Amino acid sequence: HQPSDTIAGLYEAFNSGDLETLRELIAPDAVIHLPGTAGDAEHPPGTPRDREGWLGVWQFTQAFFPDMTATVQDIVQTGDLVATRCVARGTHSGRPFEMTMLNMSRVRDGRIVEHWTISDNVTMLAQLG
Amino acid sequence: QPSDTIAGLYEAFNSGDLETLRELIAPDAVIHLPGTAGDAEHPPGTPRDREGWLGVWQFTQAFFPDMTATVQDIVQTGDLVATRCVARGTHSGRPFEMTMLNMSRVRDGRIVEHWTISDNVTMLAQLG
């Protein structure tokens, strides 16, 4: 049950802003598949990022939603693959939101080497405006 | 096994097999669809039942008639199965590949709870 612990540790580390732990738990050359909403001028929607590309997108999103946190609701493991359902909770200008996130991660030697994630952005927008 | 149920579900969606879909999904299943599947009558974040889900899926089938969903990775622990799928098709001569992530609870060989989200923005970018 080591891969499960890695992924639980990842979301803890994102919530705390713990860069050191993030960089231990994610390989520098990990293949990170972010959703099309994270697409931009240099990286069109289908294009994988590396670790620091992912942490860059995370930091941008944190600037807009400084109190956003992720809590793991379900976790399943088979071999080196871990899938998770999380709920991202925050407020925008004092109005609370709850958004589902689904993730799939490959873990090797206690580090993330591949990750897919998608968030329910439309449901979150509906709750705010 | 729960893995077999979920593999059978995506086969049945690909073939348009309503009878098998209704065998594999309980009528009272709790289906958490993304906000994109929200509607005037069903606001975003409201769960649907089976027939609500099959209603949304039938619209999506009619809109992308050559789209298929293929299970790429599947993980199982107890009654929970998560899957990563790729939805592939050519729509009006433009090819597309979009990731889908799903999580299902299976009980007595039927889906009783399901969460799904698709990478719609990536798909739209590939078509326009």
Numbering used by the authors:
A (entry chain B): 6 to 134
B (entry chain A): 7 to 134
Task: Please share excerpts from the published article on this structure.
Indanomycin is an antibiotic from the pyrroloketo­indane family which is known to act as an effective ionophoric agent against Gram-positive bacteria. IdmH is a homodimer, with the individual protomers consisting of an α+β barrel. Each protomer contains a deep hydrophobic pocket which is proposed to constitute the active site of the enzyme.
